[PDB]
Short mmCIF file of all heavy atoms in Angstrom, two decimals:
data_model
loop_
_atom_site.label_atom_id
_atom_site.label_comp_id
_atom_site.label_asym_id
_atom_site.label_seq_id
_atom_site.Cartn_x
_atom_site.Cartn_y
_atom_site.Cartn_z
N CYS Z 1 134.16 269.39 -37.41
CA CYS Z 1 134.37 270.63 -38.16
C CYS Z 1 134.66 271.75 -37.13
O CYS Z 1 134.00 271.82 -36.11
CB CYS Z 1 133.16 271.05 -38.98
SG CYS Z 1 132.72 269.88 -40.29
N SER Z 2 135.57 272.64 -37.52
CA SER Z 2 136.04 273.67 -36.66
C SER Z 2 135.15 274.94 -36.67
O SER Z 2 135.28 275.78 -35.80
CB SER Z 2 137.45 274.00 -37.09
OG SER Z 2 138.04 274.75 -36.11
N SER Z 3 134.33 275.09 -37.70
CA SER Z 3 133.51 276.25 -37.88
C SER Z 3 132.13 275.82 -38.33
O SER Z 3 131.98 274.86 -39.09
CB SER Z 3 134.20 277.28 -38.86
OG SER Z 3 134.71 276.74 -40.08
N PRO Z 4 131.08 276.56 -37.90
CA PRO Z 4 129.70 276.13 -38.17
C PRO Z 4 129.25 276.25 -39.58
O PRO Z 4 128.24 275.61 -39.94
CB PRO Z 4 128.86 276.98 -37.25
CG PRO Z 4 129.77 278.28 -37.12
CD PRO Z 4 131.12 277.69 -36.93
N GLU Z 5 129.95 277.02 -40.41
CA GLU Z 5 129.52 277.10 -41.79
C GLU Z 5 130.02 275.94 -42.64
O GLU Z 5 129.91 276.00 -43.81
CB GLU Z 5 129.94 278.38 -42.42
CG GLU Z 5 131.25 278.38 -42.91
CD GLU Z 5 132.30 278.07 -41.86
OE1 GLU Z 5 132.12 278.56 -40.72
OE2 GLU Z 5 133.31 277.31 -42.17
N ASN Z 6 130.77 275.04 -42.09
CA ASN Z 6 131.33 273.96 -42.93
C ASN Z 6 130.23 273.04 -43.41
O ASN Z 6 129.49 272.50 -42.57
CB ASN Z 6 132.39 273.21 -42.01
CG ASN Z 6 133.21 272.23 -42.78
OD1 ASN Z 6 132.76 271.56 -43.72
ND2 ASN Z 6 134.45 272.07 -42.35
N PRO Z 7 130.09 272.81 -44.73
CA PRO Z 7 128.98 271.99 -45.25
C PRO Z 7 129.08 270.55 -44.80
O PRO Z 7 128.11 269.82 -44.87
CB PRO Z 7 129.12 272.15 -46.78
CG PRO Z 7 130.54 272.48 -46.96
CD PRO Z 7 130.95 273.35 -45.82
N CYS Z 8 130.30 270.13 -44.37
CA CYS Z 8 130.49 268.72 -44.07
C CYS Z 8 129.83 268.27 -42.74
O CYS Z 8 129.71 267.11 -42.50
CB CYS Z 8 131.98 268.40 -44.01
SG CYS Z 8 132.89 268.88 -45.50
N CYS Z 9 129.52 269.28 -41.90
CA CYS Z 9 128.93 269.02 -40.59
C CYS Z 9 127.57 269.70 -40.44
O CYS Z 9 127.30 270.71 -41.10
CB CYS Z 9 129.84 269.49 -39.45
SG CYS Z 9 131.40 268.64 -39.33
N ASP Z 10 126.79 269.18 -39.50
CA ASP Z 10 125.61 269.91 -39.04
C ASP Z 10 126.06 271.06 -38.16
O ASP Z 10 126.81 270.84 -37.21
CB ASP Z 10 124.76 268.89 -38.26
CG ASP Z 10 123.40 269.33 -37.93
OD1 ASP Z 10 123.20 270.43 -37.66
OD2 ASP Z 10 122.48 268.54 -37.98
N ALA Z 11 125.60 272.27 -38.44
CA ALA Z 11 126.03 273.41 -37.62
C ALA Z 11 125.47 273.26 -36.14
O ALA Z 11 126.12 273.75 -35.20
CB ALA Z 11 125.47 274.70 -38.28
N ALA Z 12 124.37 272.55 -36.01
CA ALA Z 12 123.79 272.34 -34.66
C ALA Z 12 124.68 271.50 -33.80
O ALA Z 12 124.43 271.52 -32.57
CB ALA Z 12 122.45 271.64 -34.73
N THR Z 13 125.52 270.63 -34.40
CA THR Z 13 126.20 269.61 -33.64
C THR Z 13 127.72 269.64 -33.77
O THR Z 13 128.42 269.07 -32.91
CB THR Z 13 125.75 268.22 -33.98
OG1 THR Z 13 126.24 267.94 -35.30
CG2 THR Z 13 124.23 268.03 -33.81
N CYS Z 14 128.24 270.26 -34.81
CA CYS Z 14 129.68 270.24 -35.12
C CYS Z 14 130.21 268.86 -35.54
O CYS Z 14 131.44 268.68 -35.63
CB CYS Z 14 130.59 270.92 -34.08
SG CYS Z 14 131.02 269.91 -32.59
N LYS Z 15 129.29 267.94 -35.88
CA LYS Z 15 129.67 266.60 -36.26
C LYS Z 15 129.28 266.33 -37.72
O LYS Z 15 128.40 266.97 -38.28
CB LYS Z 15 128.97 265.58 -35.34
CG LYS Z 15 129.37 265.77 -33.86
CD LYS Z 15 130.81 265.50 -33.59
CE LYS Z 15 131.09 264.04 -33.51
NZ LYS Z 15 132.56 263.67 -33.48
N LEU Z 16 129.94 265.34 -38.32
CA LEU Z 16 129.76 265.07 -39.73
C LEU Z 16 128.31 264.79 -40.09
O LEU Z 16 127.59 264.06 -39.42
CB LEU Z 16 130.61 263.87 -40.14
CG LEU Z 16 132.12 264.09 -40.05
CD1 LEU Z 16 132.88 262.78 -40.22
CD2 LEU Z 16 132.63 265.09 -40.98
N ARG Z 17 127.93 265.29 -41.26
CA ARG Z 17 126.66 264.93 -41.89
C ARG Z 17 126.76 263.51 -42.45
O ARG Z 17 127.86 263.05 -42.80
CB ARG Z 17 126.40 265.90 -43.07
CG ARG Z 17 126.06 267.29 -42.63
CD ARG Z 17 125.68 268.15 -43.72
NE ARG Z 17 125.56 269.57 -43.46
CZ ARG Z 17 124.57 270.18 -42.85
NH1 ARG Z 17 123.58 269.46 -42.34
NH2 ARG Z 17 124.57 271.50 -42.71
N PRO Z 18 125.62 262.86 -42.66
CA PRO Z 18 125.65 261.61 -43.40
C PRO Z 18 126.32 261.80 -44.74
O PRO Z 18 126.02 262.74 -45.47
CB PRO Z 18 124.13 261.26 -43.56
CG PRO Z 18 123.48 261.94 -42.34
CD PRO Z 18 124.27 263.26 -42.24
N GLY Z 19 127.23 260.90 -45.09
CA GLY Z 19 127.93 260.99 -46.36
C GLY Z 19 129.23 261.75 -46.30
O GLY Z 19 130.03 261.68 -47.25
N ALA Z 20 129.47 262.50 -45.23
CA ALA Z 20 130.75 263.18 -45.06
C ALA Z 20 131.71 262.25 -44.32
O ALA Z 20 131.38 261.72 -43.27
CB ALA Z 20 130.58 264.47 -44.33
N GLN Z 21 132.92 262.09 -44.86
CA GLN Z 21 133.99 261.35 -44.21
C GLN Z 21 134.81 262.20 -43.27
O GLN Z 21 135.46 261.67 -42.34
CB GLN Z 21 134.93 260.70 -45.21
CG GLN Z 21 134.21 259.68 -46.08
CD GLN Z 21 135.13 259.08 -47.14
OE1 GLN Z 21 135.82 259.79 -47.86
NE2 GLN Z 21 135.16 257.79 -47.23
N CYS Z 22 134.87 263.49 -43.53
CA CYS Z 22 135.76 264.41 -42.81
C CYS Z 22 135.27 265.81 -43.07
O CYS Z 22 134.49 266.04 -44.01
CB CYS Z 22 137.19 264.25 -43.27
SG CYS Z 22 137.46 264.38 -45.07
N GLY Z 23 135.73 266.74 -42.24
CA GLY Z 23 135.47 268.18 -42.45
C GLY Z 23 136.71 269.01 -42.42
O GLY Z 23 136.65 270.23 -42.66
N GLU Z 24 137.83 268.50 -41.97
CA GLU Z 24 139.10 269.24 -41.65
C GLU Z 24 140.24 268.36 -42.11
O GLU Z 24 140.12 267.22 -42.00
CB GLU Z 24 139.29 269.61 -40.19
CG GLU Z 24 138.18 270.45 -39.60
CD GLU Z 24 138.07 271.82 -40.11
OE1 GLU Z 24 139.02 272.35 -40.75
OE2 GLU Z 24 136.94 272.36 -39.89
N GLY Z 25 141.36 269.01 -42.46
CA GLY Z 25 142.61 268.34 -42.62
C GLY Z 25 143.19 268.41 -44.03
O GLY Z 25 142.52 268.58 -45.04
N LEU Z 26 144.50 268.22 -44.09
CA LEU Z 26 145.24 268.24 -45.35
C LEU Z 26 144.87 267.08 -46.26
O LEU Z 26 145.17 267.11 -47.45
CB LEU Z 26 146.73 268.16 -45.04
CG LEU Z 26 147.32 269.48 -44.47
CD1 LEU Z 26 148.71 269.14 -43.86
CD2 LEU Z 26 147.45 270.50 -45.58
N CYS Z 27 144.25 266.03 -45.69
CA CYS Z 27 143.80 264.90 -46.47
C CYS Z 27 142.29 264.81 -46.54
O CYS Z 27 141.73 263.73 -46.78
CB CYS Z 27 144.43 263.60 -45.97
SG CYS Z 27 146.23 263.57 -46.21
N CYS Z 28 141.61 265.95 -46.43
CA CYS Z 28 140.17 266.07 -46.62
C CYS Z 28 139.91 267.06 -47.75
O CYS Z 28 140.52 268.12 -47.77
CB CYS Z 28 139.51 266.56 -45.33
SG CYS Z 28 137.69 266.41 -45.36
N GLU Z 29 139.01 266.71 -48.67
CA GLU Z 29 138.60 267.63 -49.74
C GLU Z 29 137.14 267.41 -50.01
O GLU Z 29 136.72 266.28 -50.23
CB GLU Z 29 139.45 267.41 -50.99
CG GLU Z 29 139.14 268.43 -51.93
CD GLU Z 29 139.85 268.35 -53.25
OE1 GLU Z 29 140.62 267.33 -53.44
OE2 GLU Z 29 139.73 269.35 -54.08
N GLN Z 30 136.35 268.49 -49.93
CA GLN Z 30 134.89 268.35 -50.17
C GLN Z 30 134.31 267.21 -49.33
O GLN Z 30 133.48 266.45 -49.79
CB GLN Z 30 134.55 268.15 -51.66
CG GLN Z 30 135.00 269.34 -52.54
CD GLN Z 30 134.58 269.14 -53.93
OE1 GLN Z 30 135.18 268.31 -54.71
NE2 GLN Z 30 133.51 269.77 -54.25
N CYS Z 31 134.74 267.15 -48.05
CA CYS Z 31 134.16 266.23 -47.11
C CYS Z 31 134.53 264.78 -47.30
O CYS Z 31 133.98 263.92 -46.64
CB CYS Z 31 132.62 266.28 -47.00
SG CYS Z 31 131.92 267.95 -47.00
N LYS Z 32 135.51 264.53 -48.19
CA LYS Z 32 135.95 263.18 -48.49
C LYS Z 32 137.44 263.04 -48.20
O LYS Z 32 138.22 263.97 -48.39
CB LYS Z 32 135.69 262.86 -49.96
CG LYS Z 32 134.21 262.90 -50.35
CD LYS Z 32 133.31 261.98 -49.59
CE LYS Z 32 132.11 261.46 -50.37
NZ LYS Z 32 131.03 260.91 -49.50
N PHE Z 33 137.85 261.85 -47.83
CA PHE Z 33 139.27 261.57 -47.73
C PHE Z 33 139.92 261.68 -49.08
O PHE Z 33 139.42 261.13 -50.07
CB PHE Z 33 139.51 260.16 -47.19
CG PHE Z 33 138.92 259.91 -45.80
CD1 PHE Z 33 138.25 258.72 -45.56
CD2 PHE Z 33 139.05 260.79 -44.79
CE1 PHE Z 33 137.76 258.44 -44.29
CE2 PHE Z 33 138.59 260.51 -43.51
CZ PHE Z 33 137.96 259.34 -43.25
N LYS Z 34 141.07 262.33 -49.14
CA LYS Z 34 141.85 262.35 -50.40
C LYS Z 34 142.39 260.96 -50.69
O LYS Z 34 142.56 260.15 -49.82
CB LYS Z 34 143.04 263.34 -50.27
CG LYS Z 34 142.58 264.79 -50.21
CD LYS Z 34 143.76 265.75 -50.30
CE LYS Z 34 143.29 267.18 -50.16
NZ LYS Z 34 144.42 268.14 -50.02
N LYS Z 35 142.62 260.72 -51.98
CA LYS Z 35 143.09 259.44 -52.43
C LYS Z 35 144.40 259.03 -51.77
O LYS Z 35 145.30 259.86 -51.53
CB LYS Z 35 143.32 259.57 -54.00
CG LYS Z 35 143.84 258.36 -54.66
CD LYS Z 35 143.92 258.61 -56.14
CE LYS Z 35 144.48 257.41 -56.90
NZ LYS Z 35 145.39 257.82 -58.11
N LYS Z 36 144.55 257.74 -51.52
CA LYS Z 36 145.75 257.20 -50.96
C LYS Z 36 146.99 257.64 -51.80
O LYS Z 36 146.97 257.63 -53.04
CB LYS Z 36 145.65 255.66 -51.04
CG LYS Z 36 146.87 254.97 -50.54
CD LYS Z 36 146.61 253.47 -50.52
CE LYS Z 36 147.79 252.66 -50.09
NZ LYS Z 36 147.47 251.22 -50.18
N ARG Z 37 148.03 258.02 -51.09
CA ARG Z 37 149.33 258.45 -51.62
C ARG Z 37 149.30 259.85 -52.20
O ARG Z 37 150.37 260.31 -52.65
CB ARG Z 37 150.03 257.41 -52.49
CG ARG Z 37 150.44 256.19 -51.64
CD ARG Z 37 151.38 255.20 -52.31
NE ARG Z 37 152.73 255.71 -52.54
CZ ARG Z 37 153.67 255.85 -51.55
NH1 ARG Z 37 153.44 255.54 -50.29
NH2 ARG Z 37 154.87 256.33 -51.91
N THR Z 38 148.22 260.59 -52.10
CA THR Z 38 148.26 262.01 -52.45
C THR Z 38 149.29 262.71 -51.57
O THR Z 38 149.22 262.60 -50.34
CB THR Z 38 146.88 262.66 -52.22
OG1 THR Z 38 145.88 262.01 -53.02
CG2 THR Z 38 146.90 264.11 -52.62
N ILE Z 39 150.18 263.49 -52.15
CA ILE Z 39 151.16 264.19 -51.36
C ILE Z 39 150.47 265.31 -50.57
O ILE Z 39 149.73 266.11 -51.14
CB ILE Z 39 152.25 264.75 -52.28
CG1 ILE Z 39 153.09 263.58 -52.83
CG2 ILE Z 39 153.17 265.74 -51.54
CD1 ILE Z 39 153.96 263.87 -53.98
N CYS Z 40 150.74 265.35 -49.26
CA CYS Z 40 150.08 266.31 -48.38
C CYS Z 40 151.05 267.18 -47.58
O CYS Z 40 150.58 268.16 -46.99
CB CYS Z 40 149.04 265.64 -47.49
SG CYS Z 40 149.65 264.21 -46.52
N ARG Z 41 152.34 266.86 -47.54
CA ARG Z 41 153.34 267.69 -46.85
C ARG Z 41 154.61 267.64 -47.65
O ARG Z 41 155.09 266.52 -48.00
CB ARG Z 41 153.55 267.21 -45.42
CG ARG Z 41 154.49 268.11 -44.61
CD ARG Z 41 154.60 267.63 -43.16
NE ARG Z 41 153.33 267.71 -42.43
CZ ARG Z 41 152.58 266.65 -42.12
NH1 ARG Z 41 152.92 265.40 -42.40
NH2 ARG Z 41 151.42 266.85 -41.52
N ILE Z 42 155.15 268.80 -47.96
CA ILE Z 42 156.35 268.93 -48.78
C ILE Z 42 157.37 269.74 -48.01
O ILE Z 42 157.28 270.98 -47.96
CB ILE Z 42 156.01 269.60 -50.14
CG1 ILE Z 42 154.97 268.77 -50.91
CG2 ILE Z 42 157.28 269.80 -50.95
CD1 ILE Z 42 154.50 269.39 -52.20
N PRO Z 43 158.33 269.11 -47.37
CA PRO Z 43 159.39 269.84 -46.64
C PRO Z 43 160.36 270.43 -47.63
O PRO Z 43 160.43 270.03 -48.80
CB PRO Z 43 160.01 268.80 -45.75
CG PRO Z 43 159.88 267.50 -46.60
CD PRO Z 43 158.53 267.64 -47.29
N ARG Z 44 161.15 271.35 -47.13
CA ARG Z 44 162.21 271.93 -47.92
C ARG Z 44 163.28 270.93 -48.04
O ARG Z 44 163.52 270.11 -47.12
CB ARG Z 44 162.71 273.24 -47.23
CG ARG Z 44 163.81 273.99 -47.95
CD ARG Z 44 164.65 274.74 -46.91
NE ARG Z 44 165.71 275.43 -47.54
CZ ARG Z 44 166.73 275.00 -48.31
NH1 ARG Z 44 166.90 273.71 -48.66
NH2 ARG Z 44 167.59 275.93 -48.75
#
């Protein structure tokens, strides 16, 4: 996690909490990986 207030990580460590898959990214939502084939980048 990039910031200490992120619920997905321990603020003491900057690393994922138990049960969190991720804390950052276009394919992360509420600490979970987004479903396979979810569109995440739309070019012009």
Side-chain angles (χ1 to χ4, degrees):
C1 296
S2 194
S3 48
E5 84 302 321
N6 190 324
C8 305
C9 296
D10 192 324
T13 70
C14 81
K15 299 295 281 170
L16 294 170
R17 289 186 191 283
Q21 298 177 311
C22 53
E24 304 291 344
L26 286 165
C27 295
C28 192
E29 188 182 3
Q30 300 183 284
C31 318
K32 298 302 211 198
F33 300 137
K34 291 189 183 171
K35 179 176 179 216
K36 177 174 178 183
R37 294 191 69 75
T38 300
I39 290 165
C40 53
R41 185 177 296 105
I42 301 175
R44 181 209 179 301

